[PDB]
Design a protein around this ligand. Structure first.
Ligand code: HEM
Ligand code: HEM
Ligand SMILES: Oc1c(Br)cc(Br)cc1Br
Lengths: 137, 137
């Protein structure tokens, strides 16, 4: 289930973080514009960049902590607030987060490996609700 | 489901309230001691007391609002904090709440009226967790 998924992802954080982030950018290519260092770079080019692996790991590590801090896929309001008041997120809307999760759920459903995909969708929905309540437009 | 069950209970609140609370006191009689003048009385004697219906109803009014304020059966932290800080709950530990929800779930399952008894199970456990987090022993 959802708790095992956190362990699956944590077990191979760098690989899952990179694969899921790329799946997001592939499904929603216009989202790349937010990451200026990644424009015009193939996947193998992106992996040769220290910041790409290091960013994507720090992103998914945080997501996993928020996921682990949740009860029945409802995140802490404090965690949503962290994400809203992060300076790297100043220009974002809840729509950006919706997109990331749609891509994450799609990736899970297409992977061999078992994931509790319904639960990640639900977590995504609850997190979007929380981001809105914490002031993200 | 859970959300509809809230409406069901609200639709016949005093009846459901007294009956569920009676189910609680009959399953766990030693519990009448937190209350005044409950001991030594049959169900019908209790239901004719001046206060019994009024106080049981008020408990359930608030229980339903806490259930309504929840997301996926996870109550609000501030709702838990209210229940912990109520002077009239000063003698309580989370176990008292545990016994109340065990009886409540047992009641729903035995009833003719369809309830999502397992969601109430979940909600009870999550409320206990929240009371602990709020500082209840
Ligand atoms: C729950 C989902 C998300 C989590 C947990 C998260 C976490 C983070 C963290 C921790 C950083 C700082 C990492 C660092 O500087 O080393 C970050 C940076 C950033 N994030 Fe978010 N993020 C999330 C969603 C998003 C979304 C939806 C977008 C936009 C589509 C976004 C855009 C950025 C950008 C552009 C940066 C700066 C790039 C960089 O770190 O070099 N993130 N993310
Ligand atoms: C989530 C479940 C509960 C809710 C929403 C709740 C809510 C309330 C409310 C709103 C009152 C004020 C009633 C009034 O003054 O008329 C109250 C009083 C009280 N509650 Fe709680 N309660 C809950 C669980 C419990 C449990 C499990 C116990 C003990 C086993 C308990 C013991 C008391 C006592 C002793 C009083 C005052 C004496 C009395 O009203 O007869 N309650 N409750
Ligand atoms: O910050 C994130 C981005 Br941008 C995309 C995906 Br998918 C997950 C996270 Br966390």
């Amino acid at each position: 289930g959802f708790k095992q998924d956190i362990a699956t992802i944590r077990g191979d954080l760098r690989t899952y973080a990179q694969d899921i982030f790329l799946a997001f950018l592939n499904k929603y290519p216009d989202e790349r514009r937010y990451f200026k260092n990644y424009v015009g770079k193939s996947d193998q080019e992106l992996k040769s960049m220290a910041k790409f692996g290091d960013h994507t790991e720090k992103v998914f590590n945080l997501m996993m902590e928020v996921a682990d801090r949740a009860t029945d896929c409802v995140p802490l309001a404090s965690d949503a607030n962290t994400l809203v008041q992060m300076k790297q997120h100043s220009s974002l809307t809840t729509g950006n987060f919706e997109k990331l999760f749609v891509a994450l759920v799609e990736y899970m459903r297409a992977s061999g490996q078992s994931f509790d995909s319904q639960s990640w969708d639900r977590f995504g929905k609850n997190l979007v609700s929380a981001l809105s309540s914490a002031g993200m437009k």
